[PDB]
């Protein structure tokens, strides 16, 4: 996949990485790299249950954990990870929904095989601002797992960060669905910004962060790619205006390029 960078001017002047279509199908970015020479974070488009398994992005989220799991020989099934990345994420988002704009952590290495220690964030409580009937349940909830050696990506220890967020659900209604989509991504950056600055921070940073079109495939319903390219294009503008991060940001290819077109658009506003 070709890393193709671009300098944004609405960012602050920050390079941003839009990767190229890949061999696989649909050019699907890998999750993470077999030799990276920074800690990227890679953000996996959640589902409303809160589970890593299923479909999509987030089934190859499960495929790679799984399959690095039995390579270092751990019994894990996917309904053993379903069950077990429900069961902490669904505790941690109560605990990060008493606390808005607060990272909330448990030790979940001291009961588990995959996840060394795991965190959430939220910018606002779901289901305040916006209906969850019309978004999906636990939108903006964003959660941060350390994941343990013996389920690292390609067993290097600079891809043991992963995210997981959930995105709004298309037919959701613009205004509601903007809202959403912005809480989320300062779900996503706040999270980055908030981990760094803990003693975690000090010895497994997130230098950058690879990220889906969110709210794109099964998430989308009737809603157009441009609406969500845009929104994802002002989602990111906001959260960075507000963390001002040194993180990195990625974006993961879909053969339409609205992650790029729709900050490309920003730009254009932006510079005129």
């Known amino acids: 996949p070709d890393p193709l960078t671009l ?8 390079n941003v990485i839009f990767f190229g ?16 020479s920074k800690r990227v974070a890679t953000v996996d488009a959640g589902t409303y249950g809160l589970f890593i398994g299923g479909v999509g992005m987030n089934g190859e989220f499960a495929d790679t954990i799984i399959e690095e799991a039995r ?8 309904t053993e990870l379903s069950a077990e990345s429900q069961e902490i994420q669904e505790r941690l988002l109560h605990d990060a929904e008493r606390q808005p704009g607060t990272l909330v952590e448990i030790d979940s290495g001291r009961f588990s095989r995959v996840f060394a220690r795991s965190f959430a964030y939220v910018a606002i409580v779901p289901n305040t601002v916006w209906d969850e009937s019309e978004t999906g349940k636990n939108v903006g909830a964003t959660f941060l797992h350390i994941l343990k050696p013996e389920v690292t990506p390609h067993g290097n220890e600079m891809n043991d960060v992963m995210l997981y967020t959930v995105a709004p659900f298309g037919n959701a209604s613009d205004s509601a669905y903007n809202m959403a989509y912005k809480a989320t991504m300062l779900g996503i950056v706040g999270a980055v910004s908030e981990y760094n600055k803990t003693p ?16 794109a495939g099964h998430f989308r319903g009737r809603r157009g790619l441009h609406s969500i390219g845009r929104a994802n294009a002002v989602a990111v503008e906001a959260a960075i205006t507000r963390f001002d991060p040194r993180v990195e940001l990625q974006f993961m290819y879909e053969p339409s390029d609205t992650a790029l077109r729709g900050l490309m658009e920003s730009e254009r506003k932006y510079k005129f």
């Open 71 to 78: 390579r270092n020989r751990i019994p894990l099934t996917a």
């Open 7 to 14: 300098r944004f001017t609405c960012l602050g002047d920050r």
């Open 21 to 36: 279509p890949s061999g696989r199908q649909d050019g699907f970015t890998p999750l993470y790299d077999p030799s990276p």
């Open 200 to 215: 975690w921070g000090e010895v497994k940073p997130v230098e950058a962060i690879r990220l889906p079109l969110l709210g």
